[PDB]
Symmetry: C3
Amino acid sequence: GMDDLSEFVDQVPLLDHHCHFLIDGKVPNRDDRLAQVSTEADKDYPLADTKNRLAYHGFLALAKEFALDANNPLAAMNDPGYATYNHRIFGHFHFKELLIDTGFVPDDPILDLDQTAELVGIPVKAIYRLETHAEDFMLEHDNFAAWWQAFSNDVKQAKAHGFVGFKSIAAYRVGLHLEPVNVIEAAAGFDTWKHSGEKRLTSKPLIDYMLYHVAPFIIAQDMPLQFHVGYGDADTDMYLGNPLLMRDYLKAFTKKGLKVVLLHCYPYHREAGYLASVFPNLYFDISLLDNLGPSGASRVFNEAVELAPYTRILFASDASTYPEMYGLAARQFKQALVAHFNQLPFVDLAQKKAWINAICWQTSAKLYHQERELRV
Amino acid sequence: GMDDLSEFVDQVPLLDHHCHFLIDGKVPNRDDRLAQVSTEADKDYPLADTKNRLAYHGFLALAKEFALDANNPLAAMNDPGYATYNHRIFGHFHFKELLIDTGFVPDDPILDLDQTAELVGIPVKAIYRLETHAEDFMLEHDNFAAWWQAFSNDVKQAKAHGFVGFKSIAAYRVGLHLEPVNVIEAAAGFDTWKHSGEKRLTSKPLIDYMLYHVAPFIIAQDMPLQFHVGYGDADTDMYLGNPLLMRDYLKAFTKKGLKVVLLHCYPYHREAGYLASVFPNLYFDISLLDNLGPSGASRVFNEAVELAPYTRILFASDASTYPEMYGLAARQFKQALVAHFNQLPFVDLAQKKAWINAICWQTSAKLYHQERELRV
Amino acid sequence: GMDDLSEFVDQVPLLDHHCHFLIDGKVPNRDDRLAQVSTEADKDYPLADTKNRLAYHGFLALAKEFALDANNPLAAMNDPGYATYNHRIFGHFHFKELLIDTGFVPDDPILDLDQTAELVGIPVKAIYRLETHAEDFMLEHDNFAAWWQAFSNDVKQAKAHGFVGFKSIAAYRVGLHLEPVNVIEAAAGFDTWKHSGEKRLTSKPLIDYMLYHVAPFIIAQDMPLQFHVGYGDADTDMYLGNPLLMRDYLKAFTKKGLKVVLLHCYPYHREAGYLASVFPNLYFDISLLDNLGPSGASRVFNEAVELAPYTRILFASDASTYPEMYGLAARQFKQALVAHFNQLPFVDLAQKKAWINAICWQTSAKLYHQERELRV
Ligand SMILES: [Zn+2]
Ligand SMILES: [Zn+2]
Ligand SMILES: [Zn+2]
Ligand SMILES: [Zn+2]
Ligand SMILES: [Zn+2]
Ligand SMILES: [Zn+2]
């Protein structure tokens, strides 16, 4: 029937399965940095226009709500104050763990995960970004075979090195129409890349080869593989970000045990939820939409779960830089859950609570093997 | 103004213009069969995940509500009990006729239409599935010309043989980007098919040839041609299921009198409704979504009719196997109609009722020539 | 918090930045003309089906509400009555200026802009349709070079000749996947066009050449370039109307100062709003949807602004022919604004009012240099 889940959802812990480094709290232009991170627009896009989106105003609202000094709510913060401030936000929303994709580095970063864990008050683990590791290995080798040996060995060693999952940014570089590639074309892609002088990996033949060939390595370590899907920057071709384009890859590997996680998804969240309903081992979130498109979080959540199992959708923030972005994601997502489940037909209160727990922390705890961190 | 159409919609009859065979009520694993039919996932997909979708819970709710034995609500049923149970569900929702696409055969089927009509208490007629008839004729002929003569004669005889319409499953096999094909390519497709040893018709050249060439035969019999659109299984390429891809076929035949019905449509229901607004003789439904994505039925209905004429959208369940799937479709669709029409601006109560009648039974009665069965 | 903006929105002026000529009020078949303009269906589409869409009923409701003679609400009108009637509708909704794309000519038009301004009681300015000017110049020249010189000079002179912006109908002719074209291919397109005997410009190579080459001319005059996006007639390929397909053109010119306005957008309004969030100088509206899909205006507005800046979305009607179509657009859009902003989080009442003003008139006043006309 009709329930009131607000108080329950207030206390539900969050395992943020995909997010990003924070920056140094002492950085002076905090208001502008908040504005800049509130959008995927680039540095040339007018800041005044960014400030006329709702996300920025959500960030300001949270800054005011949790401010150390109500009279100087946008002040830079020294280390004790910044830790206090982070603790207030992460604690308010009951975040219990962050899994950080360490391949994105914001300006003035806090890179150390132990320092991040001290700052926010909860455990923080790393996700291995494939393409950035591929780039760094490229610089050390002049031929495909030696590069591939070194890179693939690094991928195979990720679990041993303390990573808890993997990430591909293919959608930002080449799109998601993943198809198998012969080693001839992959190696030609490598050579073209090497000779171009550009560090950035943008070769579709080489990225697609890499993704097909690392899948067994990832399955053997039994850790998830995340993909960015949808919502990107002006250099992302969003037309190629429709996750239906991944069907051949999903057919190839999900039945073999590859756990694939579709990040963000918007505007293709119905497609992602559909895919979750027909493929094994396929999970998704509405991160980035949930904080940077805050008025859409409830309707997007609802649309996202029309066909999906509730045990396949995950909480993530996709947040970087400042705790407001984490907080806003949490607030909008938790509001969406209450609005969705309060009037949901057919199921009892206990089932509603079981599904909310799954989405917020429990599915990710299982998927990423983080059960211990989520113990009460 | 603001009306309350609940009581009116409760009594409105339904002509289910596209649905599927039921199974033997004596089958022992009824709970699991209900779960399995509640999704388009295949037998290898984890049943526990399917059971964590809302559709399964809707089916269980209806099973409990209408149960023969409240203490054993999921029991298999002998023939008198099963007829009683079917009568309770079909009667509650005021189903008055089923048009069954006889080309899908669930395991342990009830294939006889007279037996089905006795079971459910209302008339049941057949829809002629093109591709399955094409397959069965293929087995009897070693060359295209003899196959085409035999198959086309069968299509021409469908009305005489008691079928009330036609169906294409092209979307599941080859997609919906229908383009004309020369007989050379069609016959080469036939030969490749014949030589492959695979019974399943998957040749795009041959399917597209077939669809262009049977259109005049169907027009001459003045019966509708249904197409699956959108929501399919993991082997369906949903990217090719966008009905905008059908525009050349629609331009070719709708003006000639071909009555085309777009089944399911989701996630392309706005596209289908748009098409209904600019092509003659083009109808659609939100079947399969309405029962298997039950939380989406109201918003999907609303989105579907933003541009469509209300006289072009139809009720269907797309239900098979068990009466719960029929009932859930009816319940969610009837709820959508009340929610939509109660507050709809500009039109009077009488117009609201006229449109509800059109959608639920009257348009399909006209389209399929079933006026007699829908008499009060 | 929760505001009540109804009274505020009632008084907000509208700058209708994209709309179309009215027709002679004396035309006898006014009811049928209202029906015919209420849809993008063509003259062969059954009028009875058009009359079973909600838009027609909205038009009738407004006709009754504002009727000169309550007893003959659908009567043709002589000139004084027609001016009175237009004044009632435009005045009720607080229209303050119309910018008319003069490249669409309805049957029995009022073509004179001064006469239109007298009829409606507000200033009326012209938008220069590229393709129709291109067609008219084609008739006067037998070779590409002389045609291009004449046409490009006309484009360069548009501001001097009193036009206030430009419009491309590329979406209706060739779609929106704009790519650069060599002069060889453009000139071959011109020759094929010239030799075909068809006046209508349909050559993709020539249209795309034209659009890339006129951009600098338009930037130099600092006036906007409008594109039809999405919702078109049965001869429009809506599949090619996805504005994500424009990304290379937007990357080429927005940073150079080209002000691009995406008209209508539906069903790709989320895509348009996304684009507004990551490109400079990129604006959009939900015109045509707002009046011809009147039940969708609120949800479409909401979806449209999930990511966009509120300072990038504009009011337009896309209305032609009769004042009811203008009025219905205004009514549905103003209702959408109240529903959206009343409960919008994070921002204060003043910010809500600032954004409403931006959308209704102020952004367009700036963009089109019409500040003087919007003075109170
Ligand atoms: Zn991402
Ligand atoms: Zn990310
Ligand atoms: Zn189907
Ligand atoms: Zn079916
Ligand atoms: Zn237009
Ligand atoms: Zn227009």
